[PDB]
Paper text:
Certain bacterial species from genera such as Paracoccus, Pseudomonas, and Alcaligenes have evolved to use DMF as a sole carbon and nitrogen source for growth via degradation by a dimethylformamidase (DMFase). We show that DMFase from [name] strain DMF is a halophilic and thermostable enzyme comprising a multimeric complex of the α2β2 or (α2β2)2 type. The active site consists of a mononuclear iron coordinated by two Tyr side‐chain phenolates and one carboxylate from Glu. The Fe3+ ion in the active site catalyzes the hydrolytic cleavage of the amide bond in DMF.
When the purified native or recombinant parDMFase was imaged on ice by electron cryo‐microscopy (cryoEM), the micrographs unambiguously revealed two populations: a smaller molecule measuring approximately 100 Å diameter and a larger structure of approximately 150 Å in diameter could be identified. Subsequent 2D classification showed that the smaller unit was a dimer, and the larger structure was a dimer of dimers. The dimer of the parDMFase is made of two α and two β subunits with a total mass of 200 kDa. In the presence of low salt, the enzyme is predominantly in the dimeric form, and this equilibrium shifted to the tetramer at higher salt concentrations (≥200 mm). Subsequently, we collected two data sets with no salt and 200 mm NaCl yielding reconstructions with an overall resolution of 3 Å (dimer) and 2.8 Å (tetramer), respectively. The high quality of the maps allowed de novo tracing of polypeptide chains of both the large and small subunits. We used the dimer map for the initial tracing, and the final model is shown in Figure 2 B. The model from the dimer was used to obtain the tetramer model. The initial EM map clearly showed a large density around residues Y440, Y399, and E521 that could not be accounted for by amino acids. The mononuclear Fe atom is tetra‐coordinated with the protein. It is coordinated to two phenolates of tyrosine residues (Y399 and Y440 serve as monodentate ligands), and a glutamic acid carboxylate side chain (E521 serves as a bidentate ligand).
Author numbering:
A (entry chain D), B (entry chain B): 8 to 131
C (entry chain A), D (entry chain C): 1 to 762
The structure:
Amino acid sequence: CVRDPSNYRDRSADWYAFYDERRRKEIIDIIDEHPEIVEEHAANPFGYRKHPSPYLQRVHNYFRMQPTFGRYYIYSEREWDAYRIATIREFGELPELGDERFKTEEEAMHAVFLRRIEDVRAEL
Amino acid sequence: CVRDPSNYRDRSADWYAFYDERRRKEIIDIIDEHPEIVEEHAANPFGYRKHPSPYLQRVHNYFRMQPTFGRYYIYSEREWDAYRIATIREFGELPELGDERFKTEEEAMHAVFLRRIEDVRAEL
Amino acid sequence: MKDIAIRGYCDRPSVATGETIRFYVSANETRGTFDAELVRLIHGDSNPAGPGYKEEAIKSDLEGQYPARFQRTQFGSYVEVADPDAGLQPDGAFSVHLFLWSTTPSRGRQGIASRWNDERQSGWNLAIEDGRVVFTIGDGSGATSSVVSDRPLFQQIWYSITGVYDPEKKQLRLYQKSVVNRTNSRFGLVVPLDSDCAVSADATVKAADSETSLLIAGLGEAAAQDGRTWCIAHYNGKVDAPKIYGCALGQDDAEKLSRGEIVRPISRLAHWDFSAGIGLNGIPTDHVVDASGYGHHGRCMNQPSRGSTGWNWDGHEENFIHCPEQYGALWFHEDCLDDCRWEKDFEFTVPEGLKSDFYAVKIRYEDTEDYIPFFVLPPRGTATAPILVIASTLSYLAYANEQIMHKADIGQAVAGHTPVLNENDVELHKNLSYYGLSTYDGHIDGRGVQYTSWRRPIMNLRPKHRQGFGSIWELPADLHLIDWLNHNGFEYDVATEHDLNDQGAELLRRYKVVLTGSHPEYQTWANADAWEDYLADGGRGMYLAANGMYWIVEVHPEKPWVMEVRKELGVTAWEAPPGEYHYSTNGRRGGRFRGRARATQKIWGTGMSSFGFDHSGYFVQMPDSQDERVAWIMEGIDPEERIGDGGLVGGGAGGYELDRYDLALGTPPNTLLLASSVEHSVVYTVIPDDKAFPHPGMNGGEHPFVRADITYFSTANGGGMFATSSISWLGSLSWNDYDNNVSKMTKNVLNQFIKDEPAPRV
Amino acid sequence: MKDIAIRGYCDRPSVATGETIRFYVSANETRGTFDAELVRLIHGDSNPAGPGYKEEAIKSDLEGQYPARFQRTQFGSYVEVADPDAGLQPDGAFSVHLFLWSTTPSRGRQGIASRWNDERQSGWNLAIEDGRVVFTIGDGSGATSSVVSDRPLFQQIWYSITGVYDPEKKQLRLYQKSVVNRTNSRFGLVVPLDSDCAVSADATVKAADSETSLLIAGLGEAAAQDGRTWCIAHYNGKVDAPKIYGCALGQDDAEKLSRGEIVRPISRLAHWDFSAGIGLNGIPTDHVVDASGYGHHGRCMNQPSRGSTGWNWDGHEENFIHCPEQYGALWFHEDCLDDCRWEKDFEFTVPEGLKSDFYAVKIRYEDTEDYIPFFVLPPRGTATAPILVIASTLSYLAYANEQIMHKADIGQAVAGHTPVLNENDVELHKNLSYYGLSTYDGHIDGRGVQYTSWRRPIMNLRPKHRQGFGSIWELPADLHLIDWLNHNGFEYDVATEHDLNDQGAELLRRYKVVLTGSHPEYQTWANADAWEDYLADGGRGMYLAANGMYWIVEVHPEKPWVMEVRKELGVTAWEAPPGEYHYSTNGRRGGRFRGRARATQKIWGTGMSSFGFDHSGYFVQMPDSQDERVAWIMEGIDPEERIGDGGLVGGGAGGYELDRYDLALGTPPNTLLLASSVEHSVVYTVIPDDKAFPHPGMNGGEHPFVRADITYFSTANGGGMFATSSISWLGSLSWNDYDNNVSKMTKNVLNQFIKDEPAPRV
Ligand SMILES: [Fe+3]
Ligand SMILES: [Fe+3]
């Protein structure tokens, strides 16, 4: 019989843990085997008139689909003057802003990319 | 007024001609700048337990979506014994088979790949 | 090259004991005799890595020699109105009005409506030749009179067309007017369309009796011998509300006919309302009603699309059963086929002691060997085994005479490789008129094939067939499971999905465990109800397959060999045009099962997740494999082993189509998750059902939805349900000479499910 | 950080001369005064590569100082039944029955039905607290009596619930039973669900009058002052057919109530049939009918989903107007909002000499500057200009308070970059109760937001707002075109889409040329009819935009500020649940326009092809640019130049969303194809409407469908239509100080379309 809904959990989350483990290991292997994509992203983070390499694209495809609880974005103190990196929190909560300010949004985007690579290295 | 339907054509085909021209030029530039993907496809044309490189994948994505009128496939004279390369024709027409026979289907697949690269080189 | 020279089919797929099946065979030319005998199919895959082809010959009262003969096939849709008394060839003046929607107006000579003999040019017709609408009468001396329209027809534009013969002035007239509105046509009311004409010509000859039947969307070939009219010049596209008057008409009368107004109700010789008969159960009949009141009733032949959008359809109602006066059209593709109508060559009455299994009739012609597979049921009301195997005949009809690799431009892109094709594929491509099309194909118009039939030679149903995606697809992929059950000691019965549709859960409750074929993509609504009633009360089942309840199907009520499916945006090859989602056979929506709140997870635990056809993967054990509730599944399997790394279908177990666990789609809360498949390539994709916005990276190994999932859950009264969620599970059973993880796991579950103890509460 | 401290909205978007608009402003706390004045918006993009922010102050009778005050907002759906005479607080025994479908059964304390004061614990309620259903009475002394169910509720499972108070035994009883069938719930009939209970408790206190109104899906906060009850404890999920009896019930009576049978019709104190009122025009009213016959009529507040699947829904009918007895539910999300119901602060009557343009009211609080944009129309029946600019207010409401980047996990993947957000985005994320949600969001349940409203502060409608995809999205992206028209010498009027819905093509025919905003993604059916009637008879228009007629919209008939949209598989953020595709406001299907045979090509020449948000492209001239019929478009443009290589929105002209030429979707046969856009990245994708099977490579520069197309065609009576098929066209006008190909092309076409000569034929 099935009578108490607290006896049961979403057992797909076990596979989500397994999948994220293997997927993080693959991503740091990609960053170690092609170290020039970091400077490629530093030179042009939008890919404007020079589209990304497929390995930089594969790293982007890992980073850009994660859940929003704990995802980074770019706050604007003053537009076209100052940019900070903020972490998404719960509802009713202000974001946790960073410390370093930036001048343009390309610099902030490359710093978010570097901080994401530091966070995926820190968990392993 | 619009009275005679033979005065009008699908004018998107002009862009299809433009698109196919630029797309063929891109594909032969990819085959010239990474010549190891041909031996990568020769070693393992299914990608079984060794997935293709993204440049070999981009060449496959060009080749595999073309219209069926004039597309190659693999005929079987005798299964697991003999394989030939055939060209799709109109309805009611037998295909135009090649000359060389093959032993397994991996050899036939790599020969179809080589013949596709020869055909995209011949049009330029 | 190797030429196919003999064909054939059954009247019906499944036959119990005592009752009779008929076999209708054709050769290329009438000469010689063919041999025939009965075999029991055991195995079909002839891969040298496997067991190879296996069959058994059965002594029967069937074998002998029979005269080989060519049997002609009528191919394409039309409505036939039988008129033996020449009531629809008027002696004086007459006028023919209909609405028109042409999809290939420049494809040769196409007859719209006629009582026309074409061997001798006699009668009258209304036809499209050289792109224009032409009205022609004829006497039989060969010399005819025609009137030809001025403005050529635009494609998929609704036109009102009146053809008038007036002997009082000896004058043929042809009135043409376009009736486009905001919704009915290809383009809208914004174009400055000038395609109306009123032309006239001289009538030299008089129209004579053609001794044929009146046809809609076709021309009669020759004089009607044996009470049968052959149709040749097939029209493509909708025809709405045709009518013959016994008087001549003027331009004001055609102007009022163009607005949908029935002028002169006393002068109608016949008036066929194609929407007459639409109730709340759709329109499941071929009877075309003469609404004039003269008993000139017609008959739809080769199944045109009943319940289609007419000329006056605005988009305020999209169900045809609720607004039937706007759904009065009929589509008439030129390559429809529901029955070959051939003549019987022999028959077979099932003996008292023939085991219920897969069977075929091996036709031995000159240098050509053809089979005709059928199924033997256990006797009516009995069950001679504890295991039932449901043969997936609805999905056999959906893939019947499948021609994706010759017709679809994205055929090679969905598979991960250049396809390999047999001589059956080049014979389908060369003789299309003898075979028909698949539901994964399109017509010559562009619209997908809705109706598929059993009474035709289905060339990919034979067990020696190999398919374009890779190895083998429908019936030999089920002979994998048949060979595995025969190699072990299991005793099984075989039913089909037409039988399950006929019998409900009464068929299923006779058995301890019911297994499922390799790929049951298509199910009816009643089959899903029967499975849910079976599992709900103590029943046990295995789902050794993927994509297992995707499209809703209805079998035609008058014609149990015809099957309808209408598709939409999903894992599809086509989509139905806007107002035409509702089935003719029952007036219900019936798209995919997930869109009707009956997802496949809600019965079988897992459901469609991903597809892709280059190679297969292997399962890795999840932490629930080491749970002690399911130690009976994982008995002789080490907890560090891969599962199904190697196989005959693709090269692994988890592959070619995958199903996943999802509580939100209806997976039961006590389902355990035993394993999951990894190493899927970039050609495996997220199905469109699970996407909000397509962003990059919806691929294998880049998105969490691309996986398979081996699950188990138990139901009440000692039931249970086990799924492996992969097409290529059954192609991995006979690997390493039956010594692998797949056969040990499936044998563990099948030994537990046949015991008298209840299935373990998990 | 920079904190928003002042808010506000209008009663209505568009106002002609003579008539009055009202402005409802709120501060964080009641102190101080705010300043206000009227500005004319000219430009909104503050990119240093562009012209920068531009406005003009207008002397008006509006300006002054006004007292700043905090205004409370009721937030979430409920049905309110006003009862001043305490008729629904019975003096003796009573019983409450309803059906239940809970989507968040473990999210705090949630009231289902009540006449309950919560400041003093008096009245009765039926509520979900700590995951279980609890029936509680109270007198006002704080000491209450509760009965608590045994079995906790499963999520999205239909339950029948009876709560009985019986003073004859001083006993509270609670009957609970699950009513799952094959289609109504999350899982099906295969699980062994045991969730029925009959419990009982002791009643110590008696239920007293609470001096509130009876509520459905909520608890009343305090005593009803000023005739208004505040609702606090909001329930999430469907409630079907509630009823109060004036007698006590037994278990047999609850067993018959569970099967949908109305027991004891004389004892009903009230009985609310939520499906009473469903005609063939849907149910476009908030009136909830008491079907018992006592005049206790209710009212839907904050717009719950009318016309939803009930407990007895099997999937045989999916339109709610044809089977209304199975569509009797009501969804009640906790974060619905259609009106803030605030009190007016000031108003504005439009003077006689105010030009029809974009306007805003600049609120100047302490250190916070807020605007409230509105639109001034020309006077009723007149037109003071040759150019009309349709402001895209329906698509402003669809994107109102859009929170994709905080709520959607695929927000960063659709854009090609990490998003940059303002303080408006963190104030939406922190104070959600003051603002509401967008139609691109979901509720806390999971289902998308259908209804969106104007009477709320919309934080991304202000011109200094920048959006997460990149630069700027809805209203400043239209101020690009406004600034370009003001920089040249053109004289224009401004209308909205609510005005076009009200007025039809009579509004459009007053003008020589009608321009279109940057992104008109949402249109009603009547707006499409008005545009087709305008272009069909000599009208001229520019489509300077993409995705221009995608989703079908209906404005609510009783509430012209509320807009409904229901979505499906397409370019979507959500899909409607299975039986719920048909609109409440009119009982019609209304999904996307392409699925109703009204594709955007059929009117405007091009329609939706691709989307993607990292950067933009440039146009390359097709061979029809050198045609001599369109030398008036390509006048001062060299035939080897790129078009729009550089701009403010994305960095080019063809970008952010693209439309293509397609005759099969309804593009007129005489359409010329001038140019097409190249250099699109891999983040640009094929929309799901154009896919059969997803294979790899449906990307930019790898598939032919990913492009934009600049087209022109002419209609009858000297009309014409010109499309540029790109969102980022208007962001490339002011590039290089208005000296570029985009401004020269758009200026050529706009100078030709305002002449008295007819537009040149094709
Ligand atoms: Fe399929
Ligand atoms: Fe949108």
